Amino acid sequence: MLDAFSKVITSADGKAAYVGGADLQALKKFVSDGNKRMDAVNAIVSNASCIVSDAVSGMVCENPALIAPNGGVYSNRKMAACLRDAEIILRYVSYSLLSGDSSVLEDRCLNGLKETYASLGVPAAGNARAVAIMKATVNGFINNTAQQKKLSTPAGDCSALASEAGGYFDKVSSALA
Amino acid sequence: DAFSKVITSADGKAAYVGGADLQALKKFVSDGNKRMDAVNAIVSNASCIVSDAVSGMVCENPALIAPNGGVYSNRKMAACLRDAEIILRYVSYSLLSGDSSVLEDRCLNGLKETYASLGVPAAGNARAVAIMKATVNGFINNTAQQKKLSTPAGDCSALASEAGGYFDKVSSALA
Amino acid sequence: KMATDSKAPLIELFDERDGCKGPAANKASDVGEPGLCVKVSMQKVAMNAAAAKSVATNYMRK
Amino acid sequence: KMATDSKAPLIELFDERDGCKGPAANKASDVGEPGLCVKVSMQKVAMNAAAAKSVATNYMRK
Ligand SMILES: */C=C\C1=C(C)C(=O)N/C1=C\c1[nH]c(/C=C2\N=C(C[C@H]3NC(=O)C(C(*)=C)=C3C)C(C)=C2CCC(=O)O)c(CCC(=O)O)c1C
Ligand SMILES: */C=C\C1=C(C)C(=O)N/C1=C\c1[nH]c(/C=C2\N=C(C[C@H]3NC(=O)C(C(*)=C)=C3C)C(C)=C2CCC(=O)O)c(CCC(=O)O)c1C
C-alpha cells in the first residue's frame, strides 16, 4: 500500500505532505493509471461542494419530510451536520482514490459509523440515497459527462478508475446498511 | 465608523457589530434589516456572481480567451476574476454602509487609467460589470432561478436600485 | 488614489437566533438583538487557479 | 474505531505547468515532474451554516 501520506493522516494535526518531483514520479508508478488517477481525484476535489450539496439536496427533494419536524435534517444544526458528514465521507473516498486503497476510509471513517448513526436516529434510507447520489455524481465528473461543469483532460478512458471510485462508495454503502 | 477603522488599517483586523451597536447601525442606514438581507443576497452568492459575469463576458466574445485576448492564460483570467470580486465586494460594502466613498476612493480612483495603461479591454470590463449588476438585481429581488434566499415577504426595490447605482458608479468611472 | 494591495472589504453576516453557536466565544455583545452579528475585515482577494481554469473550460455553458 | 474529530484528508492538486507560480517557494523537489504537486493534510470539516440554510431554501430546484 501507498505509505506517502500515512504520517500526516496519523498525526491528524494539519501538517501537510507535499509530493512532487521524484516522490511524485514514484507515487504515479506505484498506483495504477497514475496520471489519469490524479485527474480522477481532481474530478472529485474540484467539485466537492457541488457534489455534497447536490446529494443532500436530492435526498431532501425526494423526501421533504426530512426537513420537517422529526426529520433527519430538521433545523440548521442537523442540516449542517449532514452536509459535514457527506463531505467527510466524500473526502475519505477521494483519498481512497488517490492512495489506491480504502484502509483509511474503513478504519478512520466507517468503523463504528452505523452504530453511531443508530444511536442518534440518523435515517438509513436518507443516508443511503445521499451516498447513491454522490456515487452517481462522482461517476459523471470522473467520466466528464457532467452537463454543466467539466474538466479539461487529454482524451482517453478512465472507466477502470471510475469503477474503483464506485467500489469505494460501495464500501460506505456496505458499512451503513 | 467601527468599520472605518478596519478599512483604514487594512490589515485583516475585523470589526464585529452586534447588540446596541447593530441596532444603531441599522438606524443610521435606511431599511436596516432589509438592507442586511440585500447585502447577504450579494455575499452569499459572491463566487457565482463573479464567475457567471466573467464567463458571460467571454461567451459573448471568445476573442477574450484566444491568443492576444484580455484573459488568455490562467494568470490573466485569475487576475480578471480577482478584479471582478474586488469590485463586487466594494459594491457590497457600499450597500452595507450606504455610500460609495470607500468604493470611489479606494477602488475606483485611478482605475480607468490603470486599465488603460495595461491595455485591459474596456468593452469586456463593461460587460462583466453589467452582468454582475443584473445578477445582483436578481438575487436582491429573489427572482434568481436556482438559488434563492429565505426572507420575510416584502419589497426591496429601493435597495435594489441603490445597488444598481453603485454599479453605475463603477461603470461611470471606467467609461 | 486607489489602493493596489488587492484588498477588499469582506463582509460576513451571522444569524444564529436558532441558538446554534460557533466554537468561538462572542467577539461583540448581542444584548438587545440576540444572535445577530455583522463582521467586516479587509482581506486580500487571492488568485484562484481552479476558478480560472473552470471559466476557461466552462464559459460556454450557462 | 472511527475517529470522532470531524477531520478528513484535504487533497490539493497543483498543476502550474503554464508557469504561473504562487507566492510561496517550492515545498518539494520538482525534478522530473515540472509544475506538478500533490498536497495532503488532515483538516476539520467545518459546519457551514450558509450552505445548510441554502439547502433548506433551495432543495426543490436542481
Ligand atoms: C454541482 C452539481 C453539478 C454540476 C455543476 C454538474 O455539471 N453536474 C452536477 C451534478 C450531478 N448530479 C448528478 C445526478 C443526480 N443529482 C441528483 C439530485 C438532484 N435531482 C433531484 O431531483 C434534486 C431535487 C430537486 C436534486 C438536488 C439526483 C437524484 C441524481 C441522480 C442520481 C442517480 O442516478 O440515482 C450527476 C450525474 C448525472 C449527470 O451527469 O447529470 C451530476 C454530474
Ligand atoms: C451563480 C449563478 C446563478 C445562480 C445559482 C442563480 O440562481 N442565478 C444565477 C445567475 C444569474 N445570471 C443572471 C444574468 C446573466 N448571466 C449571464 C452570463 C451567462 N449568459 C451567457 O450567455 C453565458 C455564456 C454562455 C453566461 C455564463 C448573462 C449574459 C446574464 C444577463 C445579463 C443582462 O441582463 O444583461 C441573473 C439575472 C437574471 C436571472 O435571474 O436569470 C442571475 C440571477
Ligand SMILES: *[C@@H](C)[C@H]1/C(=C/c2[nH]c(/C=C3N=C(/C=C4\NC(=O)C(CC)=C4C)C(C)=C\3CCC(=O)O)c(CCC(=O)O)c2C)NC(=O)[C@@H]1C
Ligand atoms: C478521466 C480522469 C479523464 C481523462 C484523464 C486522462 N489524463 C491523462 C493524462 C495526464 N494527466 C495528468 C495530470 C496530472 N498528473 C499529476 O501528477 C497531477 C497532480 C498535480 C495531475 C493533475 C498528466 C501529467 C498527464 C500526462 C499527459 C500530459 O502531460 O498532459 C490522459 C492521457 C492518458 C495517460 O494515461 O496519460 C487521460 C485519458 N481523460 C478523459 O478523457 C477522462 C474524461
Ligand SMILES: *[C@@H](C)[C@H]1/C(=C/c2[nH]c(/C=C3N=C(/C=C4\NC(=O)C(CC)=C4C)C(C)=C\3CCC(=O)O)c(CCC(=O)O)c2C)NC(=O)[C@@H]1C
Ligand atoms: C429584499 C432584501 C428581500 C426581503 C427582505 C426583508 N427582510 C425583512 C426582515 C428582517 N431581516 C432580518 C435580517 C438581518 N438583520 C440583521 O441585523 C442581519 C445581519 C446579521 C440580518 C441578516 C431581520 C432580523 C428581519 C426582521 C424580521 C425577523 O425577525 O426575521 C423583511 C420584513 C420587512 C422589514 O423591514 O422588517 C423583508 C421584506 N424580503 C423580500 O421579499 C425581498 C426579496
Ligand SMILES: *[C@@H](C)[C@H]1/C(=C/c2[nH]c(/C=C3N=C(/C=C4\NC(=O)C(CC)=C4C)C(C)=C\3CCC(=O)O)c(CCC(=O)O)c2C)NC(=O)[C@@H]1C
Ligand atoms: C451551530 C453549530 C451553527 C453554526 C454556528 C457557527 N458560527 C460560526 C462562526 C461565527 N459566529 C459568529 C456569531 C456571533 N459572534 C458574536 O460576537 C455575536 C454576538 C454579536 C454573534 C451572533 C461569528 C462572529 C463567527 C465568526 C467568528 C470569527 O470571526 O472568528 C461558526 C464557525 C464558522 C464560521 O466562521 O462561519 C459556526 C460553525 N454553524 C452551523 O452550521 C450551525 C447551524
Ligand SMILES: *[C@@H](C)[C@H]1/C(=C/c2[nH]c(/C=C3N=C(/C=C4\NC(=O)C(CC)=C4C)C(C)=C\3CCC(=O)O)c(CCC(=O)O)c2C)NC(=O)[C@@H]1C
Ligand atoms: C499564478 C499566480 C497562478 C496561481 C498560482 C498559485 N499557486 C498557489 C499555491 C501553491 N502552489 C503549489 C505548487 C508547487 N509547490 C511545489 O513545491 C511544487 C513542485 C513540487 C509545485 C508545483 C503549492 C504546493 C501551493 C500551496 C503552498 C502551500 O501549501 O502553502 C497559490 C496560493 C493559493 C493556494 O494555496 O492554492 C497561487 C495563487 N494562481 C493563479 O490563479 C494563477 C493561475
Ligand SMILES: *[C@H](C)[C@H]1/C(=C/c2[nH]c(/C=C3N=C(/C=C4\NC(=O)C(CC)=C4C)C(C)=C\3CCC(=O)O)c(CCC(=O)O)c2C)NC(=O)[C@@H]1C
Ligand atoms: C476582468 C473583468 C478584466 C481583466 C482584468 C485584469 N486586471 C489586471 C490587472 C490589475 N487590476 C488591478 C485592480 C485593482 N487592484 C487593486 O488593488 C484594487 C482595489 C483594491 C483594484 C480595483 C490592478 C492594480 C492591476 C495591475 C496590477 C496587478 O496585476 O495586480 C489584469 C492583468 C493585466 C496584465 O496584462 O498583466 C487583468 C487581466 N482583464 C480583462 O480582459 C477583463 C475585461
Ligand SMILES: *[C@H](C)[C@H]1/C(=C/c2[nH]c(/C=C3N=C(/C=C4\NC(=O)C(CC)=C4C)C(C)=C\3CCC(=O)O)c(CCC(=O)O)c2C)NC(=O)[C@@H]1C
Ligand atoms: C446526511 C447525509 C445525514 C445526516 C447526518 C448527521 N450526522 C450527524 C452526527 C454525526 N456524524 C458523525 C460522523 C463522523 N464524525 C467523524 O469525526 C467522522 C470521521 C472523521 C465521521 C464519519 C458523528 C461522529 C456524529 C455525532 C457527533 C456530531 O454531531 O458531530 C448528525 C447530527 C445528529 C443528531 O441528532 O445530533 C446528522 C444530522 N443526517 C441525516 O438525516 C442525513 C441522512
